[PDB]
Coordinates of C-alpha atoms and ligand atoms in Angstrom, one line a residue:
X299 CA -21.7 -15.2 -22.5
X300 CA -18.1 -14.2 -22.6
X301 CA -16.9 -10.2 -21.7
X302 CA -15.4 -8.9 -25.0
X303 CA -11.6 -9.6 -25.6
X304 CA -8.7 -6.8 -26.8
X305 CA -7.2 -8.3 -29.6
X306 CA -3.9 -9.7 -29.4
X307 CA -0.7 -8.4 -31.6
X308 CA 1.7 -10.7 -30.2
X309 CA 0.4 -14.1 -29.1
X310 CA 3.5 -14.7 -27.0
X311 CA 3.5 -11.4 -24.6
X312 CA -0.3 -10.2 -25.3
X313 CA -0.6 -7.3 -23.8
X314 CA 1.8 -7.3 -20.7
X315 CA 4.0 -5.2 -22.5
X316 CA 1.1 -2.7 -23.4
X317 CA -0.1 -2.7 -20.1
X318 CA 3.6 -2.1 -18.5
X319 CA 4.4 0.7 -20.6
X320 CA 1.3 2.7 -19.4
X321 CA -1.1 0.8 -17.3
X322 CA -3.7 3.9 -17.3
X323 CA -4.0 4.7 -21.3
X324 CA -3.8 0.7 -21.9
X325 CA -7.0 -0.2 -19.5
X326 CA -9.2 2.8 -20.5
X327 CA -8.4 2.3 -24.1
X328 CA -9.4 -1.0 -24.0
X329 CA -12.3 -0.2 -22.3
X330 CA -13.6 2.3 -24.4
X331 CA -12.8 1.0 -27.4
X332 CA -14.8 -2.4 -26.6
X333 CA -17.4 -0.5 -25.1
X334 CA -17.6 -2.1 -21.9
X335 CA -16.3 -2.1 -18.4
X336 CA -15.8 -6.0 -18.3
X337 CA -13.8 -7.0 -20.6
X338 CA -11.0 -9.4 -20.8
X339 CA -7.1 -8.8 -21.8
X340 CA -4.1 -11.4 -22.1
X341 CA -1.1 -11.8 -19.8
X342 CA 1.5 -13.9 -21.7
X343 CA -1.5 -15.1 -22.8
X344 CA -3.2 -16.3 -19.4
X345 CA -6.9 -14.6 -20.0
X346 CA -7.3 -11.9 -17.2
X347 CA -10.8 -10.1 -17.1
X348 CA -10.8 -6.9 -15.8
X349 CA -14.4 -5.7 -13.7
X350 CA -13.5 -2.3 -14.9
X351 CA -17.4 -1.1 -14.1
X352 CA -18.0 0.0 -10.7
X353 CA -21.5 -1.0 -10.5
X354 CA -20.1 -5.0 -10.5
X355 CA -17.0 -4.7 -7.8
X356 CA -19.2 -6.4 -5.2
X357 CA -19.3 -9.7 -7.4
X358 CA -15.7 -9.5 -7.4
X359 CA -14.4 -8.2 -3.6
X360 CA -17.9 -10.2 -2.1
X361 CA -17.2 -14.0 -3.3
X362 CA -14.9 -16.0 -0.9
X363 CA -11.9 -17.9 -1.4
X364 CA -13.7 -21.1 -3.0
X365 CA -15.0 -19.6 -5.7
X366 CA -12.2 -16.0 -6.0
X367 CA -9.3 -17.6 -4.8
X368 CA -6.2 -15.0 -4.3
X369 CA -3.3 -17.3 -3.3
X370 CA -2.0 -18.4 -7.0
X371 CA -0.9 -14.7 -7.8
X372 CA 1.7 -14.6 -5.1
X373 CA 3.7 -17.4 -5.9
X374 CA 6.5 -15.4 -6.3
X375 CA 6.3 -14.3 -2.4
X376 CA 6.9 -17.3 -1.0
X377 CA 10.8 -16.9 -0.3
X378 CA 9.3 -13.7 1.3
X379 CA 7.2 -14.8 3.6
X380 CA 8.5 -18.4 3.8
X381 CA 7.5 -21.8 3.1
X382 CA 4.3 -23.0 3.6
X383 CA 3.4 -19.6 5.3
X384 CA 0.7 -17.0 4.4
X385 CA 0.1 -17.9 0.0
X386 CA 1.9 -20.9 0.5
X387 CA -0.3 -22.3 3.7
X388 CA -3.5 -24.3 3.1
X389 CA -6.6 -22.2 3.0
X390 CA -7.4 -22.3 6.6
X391 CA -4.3 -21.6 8.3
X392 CA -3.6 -18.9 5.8
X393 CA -6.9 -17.5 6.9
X394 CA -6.0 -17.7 10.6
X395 CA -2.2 -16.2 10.3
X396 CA -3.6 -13.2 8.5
X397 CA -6.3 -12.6 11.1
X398 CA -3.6 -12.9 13.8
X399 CA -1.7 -9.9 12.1
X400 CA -5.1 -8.4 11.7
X401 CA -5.7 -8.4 15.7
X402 CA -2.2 -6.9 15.9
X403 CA -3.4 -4.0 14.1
X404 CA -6.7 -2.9 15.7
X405 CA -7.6 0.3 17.3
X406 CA -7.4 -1.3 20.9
X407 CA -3.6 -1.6 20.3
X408 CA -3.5 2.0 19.2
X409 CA -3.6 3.8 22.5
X410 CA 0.2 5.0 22.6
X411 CA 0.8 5.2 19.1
X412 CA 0.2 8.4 18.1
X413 CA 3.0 9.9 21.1
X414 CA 5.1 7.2 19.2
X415 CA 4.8 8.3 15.9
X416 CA 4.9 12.2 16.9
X417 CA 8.1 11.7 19.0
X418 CA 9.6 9.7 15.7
X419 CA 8.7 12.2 13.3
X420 CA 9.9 15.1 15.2
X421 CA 13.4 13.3 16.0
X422 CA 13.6 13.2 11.9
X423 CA 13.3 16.6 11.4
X424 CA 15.3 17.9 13.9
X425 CA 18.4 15.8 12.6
X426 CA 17.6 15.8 8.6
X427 CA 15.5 19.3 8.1
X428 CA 17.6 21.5 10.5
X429 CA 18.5 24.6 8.6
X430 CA 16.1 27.1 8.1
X431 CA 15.4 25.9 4.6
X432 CA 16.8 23.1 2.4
X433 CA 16.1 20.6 -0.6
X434 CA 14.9 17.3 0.6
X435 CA 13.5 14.7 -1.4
X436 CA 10.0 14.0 -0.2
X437 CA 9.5 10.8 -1.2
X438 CA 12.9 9.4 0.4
X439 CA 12.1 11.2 3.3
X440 CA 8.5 9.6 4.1
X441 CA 9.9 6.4 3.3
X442 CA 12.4 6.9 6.5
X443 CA 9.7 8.4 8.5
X444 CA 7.0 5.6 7.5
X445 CA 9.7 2.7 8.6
X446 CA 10.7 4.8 11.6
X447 CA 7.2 5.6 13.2
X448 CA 6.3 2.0 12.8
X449 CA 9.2 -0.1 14.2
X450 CA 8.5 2.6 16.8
X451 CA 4.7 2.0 17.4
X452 CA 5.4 -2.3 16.6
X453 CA 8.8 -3.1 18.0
X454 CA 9.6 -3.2 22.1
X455 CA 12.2 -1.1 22.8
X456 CA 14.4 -4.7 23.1
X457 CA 13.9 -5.5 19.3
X458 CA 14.7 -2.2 18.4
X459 CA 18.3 -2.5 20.1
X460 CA 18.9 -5.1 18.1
X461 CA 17.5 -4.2 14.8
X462 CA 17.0 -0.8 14.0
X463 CA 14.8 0.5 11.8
X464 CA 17.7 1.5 9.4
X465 CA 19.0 -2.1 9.1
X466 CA 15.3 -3.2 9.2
X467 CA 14.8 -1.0 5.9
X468 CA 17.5 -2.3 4.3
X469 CA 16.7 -6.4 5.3
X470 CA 13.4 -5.6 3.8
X471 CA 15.2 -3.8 0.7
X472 CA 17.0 -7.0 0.2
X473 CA 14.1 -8.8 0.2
X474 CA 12.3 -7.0 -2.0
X475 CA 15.3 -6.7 -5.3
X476 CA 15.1 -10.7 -5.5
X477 CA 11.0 -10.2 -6.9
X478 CA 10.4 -10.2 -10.2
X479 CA 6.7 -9.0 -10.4
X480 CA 5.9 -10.4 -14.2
X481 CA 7.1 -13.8 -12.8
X482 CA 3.8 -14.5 -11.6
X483 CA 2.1 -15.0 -15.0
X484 CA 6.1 -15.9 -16.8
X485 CA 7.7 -18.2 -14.5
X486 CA 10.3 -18.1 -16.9
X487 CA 11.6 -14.8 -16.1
X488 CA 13.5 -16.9 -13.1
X489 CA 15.9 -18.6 -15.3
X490 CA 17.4 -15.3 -16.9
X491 CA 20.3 -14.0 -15.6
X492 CA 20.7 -11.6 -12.7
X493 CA 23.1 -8.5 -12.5
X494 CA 23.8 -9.6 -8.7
X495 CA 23.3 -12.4 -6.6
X496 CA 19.8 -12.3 -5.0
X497 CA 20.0 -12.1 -1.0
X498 CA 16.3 -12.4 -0.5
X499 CA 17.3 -16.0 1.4
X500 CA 19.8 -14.5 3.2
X501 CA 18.0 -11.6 4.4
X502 CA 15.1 -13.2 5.4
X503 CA 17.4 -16.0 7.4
X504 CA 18.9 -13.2 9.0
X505 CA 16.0 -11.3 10.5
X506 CA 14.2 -14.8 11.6
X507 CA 17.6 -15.3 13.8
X508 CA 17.4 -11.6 15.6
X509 CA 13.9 -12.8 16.3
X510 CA 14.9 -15.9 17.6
X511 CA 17.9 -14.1 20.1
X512 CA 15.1 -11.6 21.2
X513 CA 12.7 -14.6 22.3
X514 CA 15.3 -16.6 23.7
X515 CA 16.3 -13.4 26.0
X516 CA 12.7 -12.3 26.7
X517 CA 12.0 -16.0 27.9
X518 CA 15.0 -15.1 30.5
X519 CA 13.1 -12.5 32.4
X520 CA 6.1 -8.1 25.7
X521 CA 3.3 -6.8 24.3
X522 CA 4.7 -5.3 21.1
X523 CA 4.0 -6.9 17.7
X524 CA 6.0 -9.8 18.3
X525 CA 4.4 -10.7 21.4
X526 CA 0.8 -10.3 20.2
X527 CA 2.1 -13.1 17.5
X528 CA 3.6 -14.8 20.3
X529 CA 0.8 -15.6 21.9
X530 CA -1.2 -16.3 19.0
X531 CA -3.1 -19.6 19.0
X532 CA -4.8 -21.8 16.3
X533 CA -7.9 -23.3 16.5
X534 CA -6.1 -26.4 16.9
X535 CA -4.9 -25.4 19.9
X536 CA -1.2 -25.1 18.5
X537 CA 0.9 -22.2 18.1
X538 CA 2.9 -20.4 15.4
X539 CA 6.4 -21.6 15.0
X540 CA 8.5 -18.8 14.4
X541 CA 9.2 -19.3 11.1
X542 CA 5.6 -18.4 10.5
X543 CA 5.9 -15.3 12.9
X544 CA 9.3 -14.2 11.2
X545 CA 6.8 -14.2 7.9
X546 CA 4.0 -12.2 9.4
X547 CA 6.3 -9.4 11.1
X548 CA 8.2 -9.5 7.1
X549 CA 4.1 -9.0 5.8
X550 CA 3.4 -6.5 8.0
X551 CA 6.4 -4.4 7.4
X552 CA 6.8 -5.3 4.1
X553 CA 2.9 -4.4 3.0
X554 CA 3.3 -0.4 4.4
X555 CA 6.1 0.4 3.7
X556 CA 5.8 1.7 0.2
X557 CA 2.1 2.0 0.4
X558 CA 2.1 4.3 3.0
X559 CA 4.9 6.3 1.6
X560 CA 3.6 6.8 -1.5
X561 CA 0.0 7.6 0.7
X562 CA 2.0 10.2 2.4
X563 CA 3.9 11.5 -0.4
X564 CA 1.3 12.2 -2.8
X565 CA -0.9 14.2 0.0
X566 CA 1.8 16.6 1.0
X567 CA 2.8 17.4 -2.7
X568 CA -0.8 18.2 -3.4
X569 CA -0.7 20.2 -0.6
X570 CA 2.0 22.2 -1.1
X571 CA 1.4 22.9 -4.8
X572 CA -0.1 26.7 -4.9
X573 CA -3.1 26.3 -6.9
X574 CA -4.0 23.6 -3.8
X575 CA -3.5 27.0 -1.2
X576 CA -7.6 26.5 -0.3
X577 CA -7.3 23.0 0.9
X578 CA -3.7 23.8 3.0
X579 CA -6.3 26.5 4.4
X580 CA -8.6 24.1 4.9
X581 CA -5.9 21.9 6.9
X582 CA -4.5 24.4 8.9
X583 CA -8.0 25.4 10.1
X584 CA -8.3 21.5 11.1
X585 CA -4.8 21.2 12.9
X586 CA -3.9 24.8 14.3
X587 CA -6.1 24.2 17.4
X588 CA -4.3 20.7 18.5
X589 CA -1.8 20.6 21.6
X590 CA 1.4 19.8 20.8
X591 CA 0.9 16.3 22.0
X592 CA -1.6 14.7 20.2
X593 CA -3.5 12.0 21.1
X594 CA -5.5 9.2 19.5
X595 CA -8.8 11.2 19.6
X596 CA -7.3 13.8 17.8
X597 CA -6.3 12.0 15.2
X598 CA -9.1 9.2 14.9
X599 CA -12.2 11.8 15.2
X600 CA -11.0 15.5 14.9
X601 CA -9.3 15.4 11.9
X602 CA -12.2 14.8 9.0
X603 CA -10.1 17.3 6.4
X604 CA -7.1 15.5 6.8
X605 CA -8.4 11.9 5.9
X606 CA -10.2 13.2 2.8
X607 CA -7.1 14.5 1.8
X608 CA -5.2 11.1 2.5
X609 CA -8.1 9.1 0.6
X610 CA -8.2 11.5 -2.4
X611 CA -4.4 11.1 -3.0
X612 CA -5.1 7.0 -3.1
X613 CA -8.4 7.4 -5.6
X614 CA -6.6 9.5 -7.8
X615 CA -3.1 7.5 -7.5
X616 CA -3.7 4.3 -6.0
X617 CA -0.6 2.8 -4.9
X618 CA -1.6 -1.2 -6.1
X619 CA -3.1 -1.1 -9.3
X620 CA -4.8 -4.3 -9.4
X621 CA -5.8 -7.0 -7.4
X622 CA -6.4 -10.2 -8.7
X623 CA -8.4 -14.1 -7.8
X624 CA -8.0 -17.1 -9.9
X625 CA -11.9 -18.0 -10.8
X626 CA -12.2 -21.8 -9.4
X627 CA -16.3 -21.6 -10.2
X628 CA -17.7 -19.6 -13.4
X629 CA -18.9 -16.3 -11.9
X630 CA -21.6 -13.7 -13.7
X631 CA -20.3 -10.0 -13.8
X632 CA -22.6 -7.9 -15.3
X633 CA -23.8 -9.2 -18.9
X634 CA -21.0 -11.9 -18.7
X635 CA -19.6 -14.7 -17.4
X636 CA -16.6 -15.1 -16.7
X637 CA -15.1 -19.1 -16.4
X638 CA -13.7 -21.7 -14.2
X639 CA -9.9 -20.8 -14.6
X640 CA -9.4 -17.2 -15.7
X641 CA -7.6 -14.9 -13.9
X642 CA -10.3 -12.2 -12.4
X643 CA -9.1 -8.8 -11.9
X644 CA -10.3 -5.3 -10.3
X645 CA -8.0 -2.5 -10.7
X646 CA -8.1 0.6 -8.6
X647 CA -6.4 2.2 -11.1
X648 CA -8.9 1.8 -13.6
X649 CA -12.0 1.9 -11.5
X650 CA -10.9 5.2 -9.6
X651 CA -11.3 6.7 -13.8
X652 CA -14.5 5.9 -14.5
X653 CA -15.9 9.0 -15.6
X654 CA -19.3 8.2 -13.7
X655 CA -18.1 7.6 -10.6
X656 CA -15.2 10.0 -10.4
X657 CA -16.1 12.8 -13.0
X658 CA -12.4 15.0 -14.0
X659 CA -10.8 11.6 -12.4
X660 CA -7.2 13.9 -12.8
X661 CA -8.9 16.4 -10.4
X662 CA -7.1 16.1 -6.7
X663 CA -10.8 17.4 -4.9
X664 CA -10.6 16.5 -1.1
X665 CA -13.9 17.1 -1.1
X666 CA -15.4 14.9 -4.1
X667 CA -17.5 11.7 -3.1
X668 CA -17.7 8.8 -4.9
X669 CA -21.1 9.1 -7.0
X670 CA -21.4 5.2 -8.0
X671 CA -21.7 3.1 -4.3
X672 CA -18.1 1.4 -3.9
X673 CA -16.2 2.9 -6.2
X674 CA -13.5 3.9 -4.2
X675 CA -11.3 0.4 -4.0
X676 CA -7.6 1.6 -2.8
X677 CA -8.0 -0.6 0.4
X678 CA -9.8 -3.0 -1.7
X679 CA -13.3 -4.3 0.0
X680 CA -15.5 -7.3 1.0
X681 CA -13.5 -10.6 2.0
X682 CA -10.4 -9.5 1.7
X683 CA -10.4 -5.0 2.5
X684 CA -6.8 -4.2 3.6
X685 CA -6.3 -5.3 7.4
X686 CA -3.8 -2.5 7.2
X687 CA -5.6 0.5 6.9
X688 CA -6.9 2.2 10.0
X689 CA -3.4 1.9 11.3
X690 CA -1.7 3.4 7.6
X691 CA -4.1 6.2 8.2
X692 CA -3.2 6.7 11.9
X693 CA 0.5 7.0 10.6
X694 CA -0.2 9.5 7.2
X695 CA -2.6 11.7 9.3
X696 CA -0.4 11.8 12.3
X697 CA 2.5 12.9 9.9
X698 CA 1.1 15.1 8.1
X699 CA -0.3 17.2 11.4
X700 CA 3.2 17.0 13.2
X701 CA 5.1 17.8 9.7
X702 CA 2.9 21.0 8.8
X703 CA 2.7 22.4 12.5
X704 CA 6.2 23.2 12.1
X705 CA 7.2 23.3 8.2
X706 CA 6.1 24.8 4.8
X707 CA 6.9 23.3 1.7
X708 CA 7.7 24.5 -1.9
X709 CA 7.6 22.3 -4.8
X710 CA 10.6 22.7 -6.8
X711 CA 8.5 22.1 -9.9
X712 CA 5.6 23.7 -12.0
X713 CA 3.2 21.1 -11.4
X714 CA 2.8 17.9 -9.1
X715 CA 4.9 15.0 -10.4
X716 CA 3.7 12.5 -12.7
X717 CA 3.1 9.0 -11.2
X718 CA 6.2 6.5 -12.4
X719 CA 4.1 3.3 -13.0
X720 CA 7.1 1.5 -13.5
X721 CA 7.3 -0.1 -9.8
X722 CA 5.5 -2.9 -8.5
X723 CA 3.9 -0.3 -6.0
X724 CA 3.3 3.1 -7.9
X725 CA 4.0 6.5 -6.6
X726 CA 5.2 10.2 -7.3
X727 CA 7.9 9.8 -10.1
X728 CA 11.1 10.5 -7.7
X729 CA 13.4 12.6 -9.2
X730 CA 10.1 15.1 -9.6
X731 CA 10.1 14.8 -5.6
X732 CA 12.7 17.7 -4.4
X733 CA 11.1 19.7 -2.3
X734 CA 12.6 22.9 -0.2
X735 CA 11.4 22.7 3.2
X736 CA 11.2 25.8 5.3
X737 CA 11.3 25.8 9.3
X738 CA 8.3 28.2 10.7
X739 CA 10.5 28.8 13.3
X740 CA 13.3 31.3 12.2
Ligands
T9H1088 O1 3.5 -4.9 -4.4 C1 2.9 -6.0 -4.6 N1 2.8 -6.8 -3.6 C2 3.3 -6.5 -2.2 C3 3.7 -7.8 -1.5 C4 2.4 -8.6 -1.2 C5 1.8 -9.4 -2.1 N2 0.7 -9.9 -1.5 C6 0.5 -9.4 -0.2 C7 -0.5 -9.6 0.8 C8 -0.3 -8.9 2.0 C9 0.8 -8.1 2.2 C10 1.8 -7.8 1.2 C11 1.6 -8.5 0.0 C12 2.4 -5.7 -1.3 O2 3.0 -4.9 -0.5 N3 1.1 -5.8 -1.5 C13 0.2 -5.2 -0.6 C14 -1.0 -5.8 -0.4 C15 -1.9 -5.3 0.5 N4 -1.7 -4.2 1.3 C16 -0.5 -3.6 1.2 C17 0.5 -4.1 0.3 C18 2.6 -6.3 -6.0 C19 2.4 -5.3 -7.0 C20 2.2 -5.6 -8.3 C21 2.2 -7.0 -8.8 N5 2.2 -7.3 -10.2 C22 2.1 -8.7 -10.6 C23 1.9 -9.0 -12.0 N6 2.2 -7.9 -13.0 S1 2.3 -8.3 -14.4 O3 3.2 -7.5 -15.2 O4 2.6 -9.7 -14.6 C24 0.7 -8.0 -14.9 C25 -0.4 -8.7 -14.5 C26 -1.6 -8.0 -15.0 C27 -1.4 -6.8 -15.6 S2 0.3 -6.5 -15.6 C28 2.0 -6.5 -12.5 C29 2.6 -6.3 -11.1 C30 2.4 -8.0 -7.9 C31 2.6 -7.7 -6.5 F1 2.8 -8.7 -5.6
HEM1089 C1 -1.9 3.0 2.3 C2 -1.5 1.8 2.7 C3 -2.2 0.6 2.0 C4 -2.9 0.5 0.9 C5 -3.1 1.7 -0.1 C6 -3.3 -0.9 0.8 C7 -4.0 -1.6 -0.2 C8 -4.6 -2.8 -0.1 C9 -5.5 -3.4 -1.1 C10 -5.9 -2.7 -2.4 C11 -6.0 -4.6 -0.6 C12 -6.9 -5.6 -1.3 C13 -6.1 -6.8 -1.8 C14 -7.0 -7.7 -2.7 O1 -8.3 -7.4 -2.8 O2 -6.6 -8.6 -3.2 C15 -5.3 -4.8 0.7 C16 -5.4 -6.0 1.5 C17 -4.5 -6.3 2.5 N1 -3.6 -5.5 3.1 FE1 -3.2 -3.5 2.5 N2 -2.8 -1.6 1.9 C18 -2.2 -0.7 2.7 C19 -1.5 -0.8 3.9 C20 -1.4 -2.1 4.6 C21 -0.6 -2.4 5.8 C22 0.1 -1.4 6.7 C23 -0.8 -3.7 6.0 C24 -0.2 -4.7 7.1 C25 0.6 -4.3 7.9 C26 -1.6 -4.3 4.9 C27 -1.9 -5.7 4.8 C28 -2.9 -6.2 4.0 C29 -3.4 -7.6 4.2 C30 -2.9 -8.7 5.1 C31 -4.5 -7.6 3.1 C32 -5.5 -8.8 2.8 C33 -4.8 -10.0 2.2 C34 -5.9 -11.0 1.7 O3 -7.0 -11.1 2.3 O4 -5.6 -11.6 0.7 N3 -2.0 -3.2 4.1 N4 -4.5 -3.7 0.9

């Protein structure tokens, strides 16, 4: 009962290299020409099927990690996150470290984080967009902001002495020019030869000692992010070493910081662009009734607009393109079933195209709903739904609000830039990001 298979050129690569050049015409062509939604490509030639139909995300996202097990496709983020930490933990332990992150991240520990991010956001612009106009990248720019704001709302004011969020950014850079994504399915790749010396180990080391100093010295005399790990307690009634909380501060970090970039990025340029001047209307009607000082009411409740805006930007360019399970027990999708050792995938990317659920899928509409149930998978769903996202949208929203209180924007460019799916983590293509900023006041 097997989903229909595009037919393979090049035995040795399949398709990866059809599917790297252009992710978006590869998956829809494959999935109109086979004439289904489920339907199964190869990835040096490990079979991956795709649940390219809306109507069957549940049987992927629902299933748990017995029978849609995510850990084998992150192989390659072990010197990341560490030995035997996160991927690389047995089942349950990997289970309870990501829920301990996911209690650091709730709304209960949200209370004085939109001040936090204001005050950070506000401090940018005053020292980076302080004529009365200039030419800023965008992109670069959230990326600052998004680190800044959350070592701000995560890190104690101790931590942050130590480790600023400018040498944070570039331990985390480090870490992140060692991966080589297509390593996952060629392990290969590893053994060719590097331009530079990878300091992924060294990085990593690095931060884990900072952390160590700061735990030493608060055990002299917390309740930021470390502390909330600190305290952390397993089932077993032992705690994390810090090895293990050194990997879920590098997760943490490490997961939003080009996701909610990207987020970020892609909102204001649509925006800004002046055949979007209706929905910066629409905006401003939302925002130009908030004090100065927002608060977390504001921002969780009173601004509707604003988040539609934010979710649009990821259906229409979803930052992770698809997510992926290693099947451990035959599964049905739709007409098919799909066996015991294939790689299962869902792609936002794909999904967020389907003409049925997202007619004119090109279309930035704030307003549009998904008309197929589910659709919408950018912060995935079921079992494992981003832990992330209510404080990613806390930060966008929040940014957004403080940067167009005091700024307008002008694209440099006729039309919003293409996406560059070239990265790992896709956003705006960045030399299609300059931007001239101009300060409402004078
Ligand atoms: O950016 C990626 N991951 C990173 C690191 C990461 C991994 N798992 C996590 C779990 C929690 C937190 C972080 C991570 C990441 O930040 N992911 C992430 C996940 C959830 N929320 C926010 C961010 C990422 C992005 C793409 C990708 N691939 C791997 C395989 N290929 S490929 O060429 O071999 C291919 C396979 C199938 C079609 S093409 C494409 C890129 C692999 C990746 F790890
Ligand atoms: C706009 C920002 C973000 C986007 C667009 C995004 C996207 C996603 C997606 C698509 C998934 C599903 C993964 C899957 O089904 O395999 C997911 C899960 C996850 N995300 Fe995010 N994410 C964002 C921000 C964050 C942040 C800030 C964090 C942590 C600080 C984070 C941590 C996680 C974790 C721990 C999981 C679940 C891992 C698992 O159960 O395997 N995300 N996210």
């Amino acid at each position: 009962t097997d989903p229909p298979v595009y037919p393979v050129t090049v035995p040795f690569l399949g398709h990866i290299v059809q599917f790297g050049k252009n992710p978006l015409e590869f998956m829809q062509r494959c999935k109109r020409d086979l004439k289904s939604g489920v339907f199964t490509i190869s990835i040096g030639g490990q079979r991956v099927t795709i649940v390219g139909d809306p109507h069957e995300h549940s049987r992927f996202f629902s299933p748990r990690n017995e029978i849609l097990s995510p850990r084998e496709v992150y192989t390659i983020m072990t010197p990341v996150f560490g030995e035997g930490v996160a991927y690389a933990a047995p089942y349950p332990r990997m289970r309870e470290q990501l829920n301990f992150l996911a209690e650091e991240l709730t709304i209960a520990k949200f209370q004085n984080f939109v001040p936090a991010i204001q005050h950070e956001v506000r401090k940018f612009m005053a020292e980076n967009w302080k004529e009365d106009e200039g030419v800023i990248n965008l992109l670069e720019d959230c990326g600052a902001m998004i680190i800044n704001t959350a070592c701000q709302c995560l890190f104690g004011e101790d931590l942050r002495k130590r480790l600023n969020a400018r040498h944070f950014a570039q331990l985390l850079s480090k870490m992140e020019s060692s991966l080589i994504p297509a390593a996952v399915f060629m392990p290969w790749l590893l053994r060719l030869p590097l331009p530079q010396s990878a300091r992924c180990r060294e990085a990593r080391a690095e931060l884990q000692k900072i952390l160590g100093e700061i735990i030493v010295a608060r055990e002299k005399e917390t309740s930021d992010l470390l502390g909330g790990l600190l305290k952390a307690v397993y089932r077993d009634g032992t705690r994390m070493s810090l090895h293990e909380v050194c990997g879920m501060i590098v997760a943490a970090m490490f997961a939003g910081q080009h996701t909610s970039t990207i987020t970020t990025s892609w909102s204001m340029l649509h925006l800004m662009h002046p055949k979007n001047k209706k929905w910066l209307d629409k905006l401003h009607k939302e925002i130009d009734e908030f004090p100065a000082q927002l608060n977390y009411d504001n921002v969780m409740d009173e601004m509707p607009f604003a988040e539609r805006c934010v979710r649009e930007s990821i259906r229409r360019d979803p930052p992770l393109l698809m997510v992926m399970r290693m099947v451990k027990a035959e599964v049905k999708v739709g007409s098919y079933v799909v066996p015991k050792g294939d790689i299962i995938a869902c792609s936002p990317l794909l999904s967020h195209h389907d003409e049925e659920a997202f007619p004119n899928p090109r279309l930035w509409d704030p307003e549009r709903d998904e008309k197929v149930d589910g659709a919408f998978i950018g912060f995935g769903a079921g079992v494992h739904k981003c832990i992330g996202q209510k404080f990613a949208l806390l930060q966008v929203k929040t940014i957004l609000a403080t940067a167009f209180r005091e700024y307008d924007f002008q694209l440099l460019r006729d039309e919003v830039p293409d996406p560059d799916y070239h990265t790992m983590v896709v956003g705006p293509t960045l030399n299609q990001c300059l931007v001239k900023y101009t300060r409402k006041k004078k």
